[PDB]
Amino acid sequence: WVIMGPGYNGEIKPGTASNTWCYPTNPVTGEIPTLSALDIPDGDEVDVQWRLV
Amino acid sequence: AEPVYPDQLRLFPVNREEAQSVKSNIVGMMGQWQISGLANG
């Protein structure tokens, strides 16, 4: 199977080629990392918001 | 970063964000066409 580019409307048909798309043998996970929490000094709701922004 | 109370200010340390947080009070306490520095240029 081969895949054709624009102008061929992306048609996928049987064929042959030496340039092959290939997902690397060991791909990686693209998850968003999780960081440690940020500590705000104690106060009332508005003081905490002011310190945050 | 830290709250600033205008009654504690002294024209002899002051961040740009701190100066912008309390702006009208600082402007009112200085003379017209007066220029004074804050910090870091």
Chain A closest CA to B3's CA: distance in Å? 8
A51 contacts in chain B (CB < 8 Å): 1
Q: How far is Cα A27 from Cα A21, in angstroms, rounded to an integer?
A: 14
Place of tokens 């600033």: B4
Method used to obtain the model = cryo-EM
Closest-CA residue in chain B for A52? B1
Q: Where are the alpha helices (DSSP H) in chain A?
A: 45-52
Q: How far is Cα A22 from Cα A6, in angstroms, rounded to an integer?
A: 20
| Cβ-based interface (< 8 Å): residues of A facing B | 47, 50-51
Measured CA to CA in angstroms, residue A19 lies from A8, A9, A24, A42, B32 at distances of 18, 19, 14, 61, 73
Q: To the nearest 10°, the Cα dihedral for A42, A45, A51, B3?
A: -80
Q: How many residues does chain B have?
A: 41
User: What three-state secondary structure class fits A3?
Assistant: strand
Specify whether the CB–CB gap between B33 and B9 falls below 8 A. no
Residue type, A48: V
Cα end-to-end span (Å), chain B: 18
Measured CA to CA in angstroms, residue B36 lies from A44, A48, B17, B27, B32 at distances of 34, 31, 16, 11, 12
